[PDB]
Write a protein that binds this ligand. Structure first.
Ligand SMILES: O=C(O)c1cc(=O)[nH]c(=O)n1[C@@H]1O[C@H](COP(=O)(O)O)[C@@H](O)[C@H]1O
Ligand SMILES: O=c1ccn([C@@H]2O[C@H](COP(=O)(O)O)[C@@H](O)[C@H]2O)c(=O)[nH]1
Lengths: 256, 256
């Protein structure tokens, strides 16, 4: 097993993955903030205050009540300042011809500001081919959703294996996975795991939580994605630091 | 086998399904226009000219370069005038807590103007439970994606069966399917089929086409969804009439 810093230098590493792995090592963070807020001002205040603690800020641009492209310019300024990637959790899941337009165009122009997006594999590899025709020229990366945190997820067994094959066949654009665990044996790929809180529990709409120690240390994932465990806390900076220290120590203890 | 008009009266029919089935019977159309355009003016000019020929207009609001809620108000005026439903093909595919926000909020406020939306079943039934919390109070309906038209689709076998079970267990909100065929034996559910053109072929990003006679007549679906077969034609009105007459006669000949 290699450190994040050594994985950043692997021969087959994608440039976006390399940039991420280098800043994870530099800052001692494998925490992705899930910035699940509706106000631009709260998004930007969280990005500024928590920027030093995170490797990545995950957005749902389509729940922002006051989205503008100027908000995303301000988020990029903070991402450059504090050194984190922007990941739009859009979960592209349509035919290739449609997702290319959803990624490049419309109001959001996601490809113009998102370092990373993700896609479901259920439509077949056309979803990746469509995205990559916008994303490759714009030097972007993509994550494939191999496993899901929610109750009743059908992303198991042969489905998860299909996601890994699709990733490993589109390595010029696909840099890793949304997963609950290590699903690829190839160290070039990133594993990002949502459904994370320090305490046992869930929500009322099928979310299930596991701890950073479980998902990073026992299940072998790289990055924790944390929304409400941070966002709903009074002191979101201290909460981010608790999640960062948990995920980072779990990573170190697997390295030996 | 019952006519659309008789299905509109079934005891367990959803009000949105009933409204749709009644206008399908009245207008002799089981054509859904896939209005895959980037300009509001072209969307509205197609909705006005083709409105009499269609039971439904399917949108991808996120590819409209000049989206505003006022555009949606003008589309509703045309939907009411010509009698068709509005279906936003958003393919919700996240945890329940997230999709509720994506459906009600952000800049699109999809639930405010869309009669119908759709969802992938891969996250488990929480996706439906989250949507239905917004959609039930707003008197909306949902379609579940049981089969996909694209090459390499994983929506087959047990996945398709899981989509049908999820629909039949959430019948207060789920009114039917995106599918390539009849997948439910319950006549209360609508089957809408994309990947339709009069000529054999596909696109360069995994889209596969079948004819209206094949999907309505042989595969037993209710509604054809047609994008480029109409939108790329010079005369979109005559193209819509060709598709309407094809789908309607295929339906009649299955009835006897
Ligand atoms: O792609 C995602 O990040 C995602 C995948 C998944 O399997 N589960 C999941 O919860 N998510 C997202 O990650 C976040 C989880 O948020 P919390 O439950 O608040 O920590 C939400 O924004 C979800 O939309
Ligand atoms: O299985 C599916 C589901 C949706 N769709 C959508 O239907 C439309 C098909 O358009 P087309 O006729 O131009 O190929 C397009 O908007 C797709 O996003 C499919 O093509 N297949």
């Amino acid at each position: 097993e290699l450190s994040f810093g050594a994985r950043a230098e692997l021969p087959r590493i994608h440039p976006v993955a390399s940039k991420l792995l280098r800043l994870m090592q530099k800052k001692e963070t494998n925490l992705c903030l899930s910035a699940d807020v509706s106000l631009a001002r709260e998004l930007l205040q969280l990005a500024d205050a928590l920027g030093p603690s995170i490797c990545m800020l995950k957005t749902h641009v389509d729940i922002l009540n006051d989205f503008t492209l100027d908000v995303m310019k301000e988020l990029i300024t903070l991402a450059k300042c504090h050194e984190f990637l922007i990941f739009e959790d859009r979960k592209f899941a349509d035919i290739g011809n449609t997702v290319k337009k959803q990624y490049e165009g419309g109001i959001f122009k996601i490809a113009s500001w998102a370092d990373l997006v993700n896609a479901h594999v259920v439509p077949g590899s056309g979803v990746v081919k469509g995205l990559q025709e916008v994303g490759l020229p714009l030097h972007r990366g993509c994550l494939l959703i191999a496993e899901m945190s929610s109750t009743g997820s059908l992303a198991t067994g042969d489905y998860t294996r299909a996601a890994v094959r699709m990733a490993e066949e589109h390595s010029e654009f696909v840099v890793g996975f949304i997963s609950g665990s290590r699903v690829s044996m190839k160290p070039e790929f990133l594993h990002l795991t949502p459904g994370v809180q320090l305490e046992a529990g869930g929500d009322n709409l099928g979310q299930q939580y596991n701890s950073p120690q479980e998902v990073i240390g026992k299940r072998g994932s790289d990055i924790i994605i944390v929304g409400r465990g941070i966002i709903s806390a009074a002191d979101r900076l201290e909460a981010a630091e608790m999640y960062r220290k948990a995920a980072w120590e779990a990573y170190l203890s697997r390295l030996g």
